[PDB]
Amino acid sequence: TLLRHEGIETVSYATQSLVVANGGLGNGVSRNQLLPVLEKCGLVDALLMPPNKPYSFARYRTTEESKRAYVTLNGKEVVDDLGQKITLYLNFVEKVQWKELRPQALPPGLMVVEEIISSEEEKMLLESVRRVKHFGYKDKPLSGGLPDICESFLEKWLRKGYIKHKPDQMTINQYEPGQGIPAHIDTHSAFEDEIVSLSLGSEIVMDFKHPDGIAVPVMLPRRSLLVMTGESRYLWTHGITCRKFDTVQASEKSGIITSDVGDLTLSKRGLRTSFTFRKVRQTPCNCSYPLVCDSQRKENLYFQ
Numbered sequence: 101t102l103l104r105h106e107g108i109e110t111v112s113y114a115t116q117s118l119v120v121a122n123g124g125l126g127n128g129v130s131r132n133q134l135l136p137v138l139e140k141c142g143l144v145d146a147l148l149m150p151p152n153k154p155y156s157f158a159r160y161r162t163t164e165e166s167k168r169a170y171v172t173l174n175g176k177e178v179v180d181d182l183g184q185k186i187t188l189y190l191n192f193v194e195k196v197q198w199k200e201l202r203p204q205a206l207p208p209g210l211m212v213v214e215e216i217i218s219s220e221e222e223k224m225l226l227e228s229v230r231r232v233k234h235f236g237y238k239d240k241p242l243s244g245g246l247p248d249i250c251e252s253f254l255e256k257w258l259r260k261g262y263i264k265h266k267p268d269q270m271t272i273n274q275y276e277p278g279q280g281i282p283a284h285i286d287t288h289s290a291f292e293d294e295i296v297s298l299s300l301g302s303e304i305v306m307d308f309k310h311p312d313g314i315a316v317p318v319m320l321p322r323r324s325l326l327v328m329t330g331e332s333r334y335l336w337t338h339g340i341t342c343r344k345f346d347t348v349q350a351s352e353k354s355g356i357i358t359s360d361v362g363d364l365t366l367s368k369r370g371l372r373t374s375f376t377f378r379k380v381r382q383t384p385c386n387c388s389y390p391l392v393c394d395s396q397r398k399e400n401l402y403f404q
């Protein structure tokens with residue numbers, strides 16, 4: 101979906117314009133970094149770099165040079181602002197155009213309970229102990245169980261209705277200014293459906309992405325309980341992109357804030373600790389999302 105959903109039509113014959121994948125601004129690729137490369141094949145008439153996009157567009161003076169770029173730059177590697185290693189992929193385009201999408205609701209199933217605990221309770225939970233610690237649990241070897249300070253809050257949560265499935269497994273995640281968790285999807289054949297995460301410490305933004313291309317950055321405020329179930333916990337994937345700052349609604353909002361709707365400002369994330377509670381399931385899964393399911397992808401070598 102690197103460019104299919106994006107509405108980027110590609111052709112199989114050499115043209116003056118190309119499409120550099122992963123060579124975009126929304127990928128930490130600097131113009132002072134990409135251009136010096138692209139010009140290693142010929143005269144570059146223009147270098148289009150749309151904001152918040154994982155790709156850019158390059159046009160050469162003549163298709164001869166543009167053709168040389170397609171053949172000597174595919175597979176090439178470059179360093180982003182983080183200093184990581186990303187692979188560049190080029191392709192010929194007959195028109196420079198793309199699709200802009202702005203989601204208007206959190207992924208189906210995802211819910212965000214705000215101000216679940218008071219400022220005092222937060223301080224407590226914090227002082228009760230990237231770094232990671234497991235509790236409850238390899239669904240065969242388990243431990244004494246979840247701590248007492250948690251068994252309560254949990255009961256209080258399900259007493260209300262914020263969650264209707266008492267967990268038994270917990271994972272502690274503490275992030276420091278710059279850390280983050282790589283996009284993933286909790287194993288289907290492991291933990292039950294409903295999953296909740298209590299985020300304390302400081303604000304942070306998560307990246308939920310639909311398998312087709314719909315990306316939705318959620319805003320997880322302090323003392324808030326992230327509750328994801330259904331399509332959001334099975335199909336969509338979440339993550340935390342490494343960084344020390346991140347765009348936010350320059351106004352009030354625990355949720356999805358898109359661009360071109362008002363004002364944007366920056367915010368530095370501090371120390372963030374999260375309590376992710378899950379419920380291990382004994383039975384195999386049979387959700388409506390077999391493609392991202394290993395419990396279902398096992399009854400057929402095709403997928404394996």
Ligand SMILES: O=C(O)CCC(=O)C(=O)O
Nearest residue numbers: 271273281297338374376
């Ligand atoms: O929201 C968090 O940071 C914790 C949930 C999570 O993605 C995990 O630890 O698998």
Ligand SMILES: [Mn+2]
Nearest residue numbers: 284285286338
């Ligand atoms: Mn997870």
Ligand SMILES: [Zn+2]
Nearest residue numbers: 288385387393
């Ligand atoms: Zn499944």
